[PDB]
Amino acid sequence: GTVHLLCLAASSGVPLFCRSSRGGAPALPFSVIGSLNGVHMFGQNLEVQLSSARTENTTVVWKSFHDSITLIVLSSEVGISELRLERLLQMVFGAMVLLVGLEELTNIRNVERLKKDLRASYCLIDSFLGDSELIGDLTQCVDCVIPPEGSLLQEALSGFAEAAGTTFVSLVVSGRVVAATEGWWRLGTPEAVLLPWLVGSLPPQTARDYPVYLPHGSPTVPHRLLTLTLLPSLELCLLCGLYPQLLERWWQPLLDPLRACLPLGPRALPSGFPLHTDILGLLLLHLELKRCLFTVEPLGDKEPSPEQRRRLLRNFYTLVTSTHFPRACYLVLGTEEPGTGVRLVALQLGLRRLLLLLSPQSPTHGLRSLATHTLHALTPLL
Amino acid sequence: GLNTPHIIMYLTLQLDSETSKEEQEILYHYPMSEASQKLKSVRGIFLTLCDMLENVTGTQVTSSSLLLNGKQIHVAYWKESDKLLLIGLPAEEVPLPRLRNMIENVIQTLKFMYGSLDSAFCQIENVPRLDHFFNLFFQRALQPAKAQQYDASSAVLLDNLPGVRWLTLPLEIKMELDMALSDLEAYTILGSSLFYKGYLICSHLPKDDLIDIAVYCRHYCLLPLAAKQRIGQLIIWREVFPQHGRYFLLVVGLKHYMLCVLLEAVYVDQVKTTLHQLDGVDSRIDERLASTLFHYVALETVQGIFITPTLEEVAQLSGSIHPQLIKNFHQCCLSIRAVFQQTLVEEKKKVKEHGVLFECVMAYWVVGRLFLHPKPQELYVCFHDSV
Numbered sequence A: 001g002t003v004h005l006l007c008l009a010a011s012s013g014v015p016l017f018c019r020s021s022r023g024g025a026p027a028l029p030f031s032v033i034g035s036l037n038g039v040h041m042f043g044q045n046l047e048v049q050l051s052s053a054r055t056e057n058t059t060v061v062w063k064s065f066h067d068s069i070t071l072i073v074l075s076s077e078v079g080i081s082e083l084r085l086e087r088l089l090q091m092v093f094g095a096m097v098l099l100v101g102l103e104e105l106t107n108i109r110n111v112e113r114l115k116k117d118l119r120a121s122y123c124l125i126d127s128f129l130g131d132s133e134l135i136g137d138l139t140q141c142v143d144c145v146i147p148p149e150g151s152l153l154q155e156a157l158s159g160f161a162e163a164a165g166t167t168f169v170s171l172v173v174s175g176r177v178v179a180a181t182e183g184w185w186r187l188g189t190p191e192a193v194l195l196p197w198l199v200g201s202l203p204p205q206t207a208r209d210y211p212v213y214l215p216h217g218s219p220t221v222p223h224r225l226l227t228l229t230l231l232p233s234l235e236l237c238l239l240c241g242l243y244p245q246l247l248e249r250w251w252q253p254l255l256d257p258l259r260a261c262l263p264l265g266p267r268a269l270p271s272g273f274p275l276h277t278d279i280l281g282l283l284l285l286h287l288e289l290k291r292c293l294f295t296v297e298p299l300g301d302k303e304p305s306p307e308q309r310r311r312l313l314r315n316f317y318t319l320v321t322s323t324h325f326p327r328a329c330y331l332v333l334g335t336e337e338p339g340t341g342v343r344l345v346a347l348q349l350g351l352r353r354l355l356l357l358l359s360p361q362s363p364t365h366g367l368r369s370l371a372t373h374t375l376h377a378l379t380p381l382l
Numbered sequence B: 001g002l003n004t005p006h007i008i009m010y011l012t013l014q015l016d017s018e019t020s021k022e023e024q025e026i027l028y029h030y031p032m033s034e035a036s037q038k039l040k041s042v043r044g045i046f047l048t049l050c051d052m053l054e055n056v057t058g059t060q061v062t063s064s065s066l067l068l069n070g071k072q073i074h075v076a077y078w079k080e081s082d083k084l085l086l087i088g089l090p091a092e093e094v095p096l097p098r099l100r101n102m103i104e105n106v107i108q109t110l111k112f113m114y115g116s117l118d119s120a121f122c123q124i125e126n127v128p129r130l131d132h133f134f135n136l137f138f139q140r141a142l143q144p145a146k147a148q149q150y151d152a153s154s155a156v157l158l159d160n161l162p163g164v165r166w167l168t169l170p171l172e173i174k175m176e177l178d179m180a181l182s183d184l185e186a187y188t189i190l191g192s193s194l195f196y197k198g199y200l201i202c203s204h205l206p207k208d209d210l211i212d213i214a215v216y217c218r219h220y221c222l223l224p225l226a227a228k229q230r231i232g233q234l235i236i237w238r239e240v241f242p243q244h245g246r247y248f249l250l251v252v253g254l255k256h257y258m259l260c261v262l263l264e265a266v267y268v269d270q271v272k273t274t275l276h277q278l279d280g281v282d283s284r285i286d287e288r289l290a291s292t293l294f295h296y297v298a299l300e301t302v303q304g305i306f307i308t309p310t311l312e313e314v315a316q317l318s319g320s321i322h323p324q325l326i327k328n329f330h331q332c333c334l335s336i337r338a339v340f341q342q343t344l345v346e347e348k349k350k351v352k353e354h355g356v357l358f359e360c361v362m363a364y365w366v367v368g369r370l371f372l373h374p375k376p377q378e379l380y381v382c383f384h385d386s387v
Helices: A030-045 A082-099 A113-119 A122-129 A151-164 A182-186 A189-201 A246-250 A255-261 A306-324 A367-378 B034-041 B043-056 B096-114 B117-122 B127-142 B150-158 B171-185 B207-219 B267-276 B281-290 B311-316 B322-349
Strands: A003-009 A015-017 A063-065 A069-075 A142-144 A169-173 A176-180 A207-212 A223-231 A234-240 A279-286 A291-295 A328-332 A343-347 A354-358 B007-011 B026-029 B064-068 B071-076 B086-090 B188-196 B199-203 B231-240 B247-255 B257-264 B305-307 B353-357 B367-371 B377-381
Touching: A003 A030, A003 A122, A015 A030, A015 A113, A030 A069, A030 B043, A063 A082, A069 A082, A082 A113, A082 A122, A082 A189, A082 A306, A122 A189, A142 A189, A151 A169, A151 A176, A151 A234, A151 A246, A151 A255, A169 A189, A176 A182, A189 A207, A189 A234, A279 A306, A279 A367, A306 A328, A306 A343, A306 A354, A306 B322, A328 A367, A343 A367, A354 A367, B007 B034, B007 B043, B026 B034, B026 B117, B034 B043, B071 B096, B086 B096, B086 B127, B096 B117, B096 B127, B096 B207, B096 B322, B127 B207, B150 B311, B150 B322, B171 B188, B171 B199, B171 B267, B171 B281, B188 B207, B199 B207, B207 B231, B207 B247, B207 B257, B231 B257, B247 B267, B257 B267, B322 B353, B322 B367, B322 B377
Parallel strands: A142 A176, A142 A291
Antiparallel strands: A003 A015, A003 A069, A063 A069, A169 A176, A169 A234, A207 A223, A223 A234, A279 A291, A279 A354, A328 A343, A328 B353, A343 A354, B007 B026, B007 B086, B064 B071, B071 B086, B188 B199, B188 B257, B231 B247, B247 B257, B353 B367, B367 B377
């Protein structure tokens, strides 16, 4: 479970940083990093990319971005997949773009200043490396939480957007977005995952103003993002190209619904939602809507560690991305002793792929019927 | 296959000679053509990556994935002793787990042929033999061609399994075969394995030796299938080294019989006489071969054999989309084998009921089941959603 990430000056051949998450987030010889840089450059000159060089114990993935930056990963993770690493590199480059931008990343090469600009990115990068509570870094879909059946939340969000004169305003909880403007929804997928993730990774302050360069919206135009902490673990994201009082103008009468959805962050599911008792994990994916509903704790009895459940669901997704991309799958796993392990199910229907973790005692015969019923139940939600 | 790049190469690892010519590095290189010159040039990154990853990681490189000229190329490594052996093929035809199984089989077959593969490649006299074998192997991997397609369609997994196509033997024919084989045993015979029409009809050989001999035959065109033209007189008498003094593989193919023997340090005449009296057993097995699980790939790894419906059965079972159904089965079985292969690595260090569902209108519901507590085995099944 050790990951060593590396970012390198492609043309210059000088290390940029070596953020590592060996044995968890808290965590290399110069000669070795020079060696991997040399093999990557030798591949580049010979017009042959280096996608992966997986070994028995580790696995590595190079990524030459804009022929200007070089990305390496050394993942000793058990059961690590190529797709997870590819998504990780793509999204970490998205993060680097967000923190700095297209300029100072391509073309002009800062020998030592770029160190200073990238110093701020380290928090986001090592939040990415660690086993966070979100999946947007894997599935490329923005992590969402169903609102407590309240359209008044969307109406108040729109009113706040009109009052602040900004079309990018979104209420996010614990890094998971519960409400957003239509412009925020239409905003590009890598930054769509990044922005709530960055907000969650940031320490809680009263109000924060930070510069961001949208990888698809505006890599050159330095947009400004305002985080308004109404209550801890829930924030308002105000993204515009300065001292608003409208938080108490609009959210003050909305305190009750906001408190209702306050615990929904980890819950990621409307309170008292009717679901089958065998379900221990929901990972609804709406690729058409580019959203993902990720509930990890509908029951803490079997596999009590939520981290274990999240790792299992992520590994299942990395194994099902090769198969899926009516069709369904199920990958009953665990110890060979009966009555242990888990049952992981996948269903694809109308760009509504869904992963189901089930109880170890869940019958294997009706797995597909259970998945169909769950998808029908969750269809109006997302 | 001809256009797609493919390389077998044997660079000398940890070379300390300033003469960096390709001959100094490469000891053996079969293709030596346009499709391999690229990889011959890019061998430097292979060597450097192998040694660096051996340094940082306690394990050596098992697979490198290179996106060359817009197409994916998987190369499998092998470091043994100051030597490195590389096999690279495009991914879109052979997936990575298939490539790893293929390199395992190739190294096993080379060790079977010439013992220490270092002596296999260093020698120059055997270079034409290695070139012919690698030509046949590359053709098998990249060109499935050359009912005639069912074997090619399933060979994606059949070659992957550590077993041999086995036929459900009627008991009377079984004891007749055992009696015949015992008479044949009556140098030093270390066992045998008689095949019929490409089906392993009897096996007195140890599992490892039988698997080695069978994969050696599979790398060639010796083993037939689909009741090919009766093998005329192909008799092979070669030296082998099945990881156990001097050992010889004998094999006689007469009619549909593909009989093989292992000998330790004129026998052709006695084995021919033995199979001559077996002129009625083929008749007894013909109609048995002729005579809602739409497809099973039931396996027995401990025994080293597996059972699947015969081609006459699938011809009888041929339906609306069954020709596509079987190939869909056989390409999904590779992924099922890959996950089960991870589980097998976990087991041998000291998951079980995988399944998918298709509709490309009937619910195929192909499912791979694993058994470890009893005699370990794998079961790949098809069934409609009604059942």
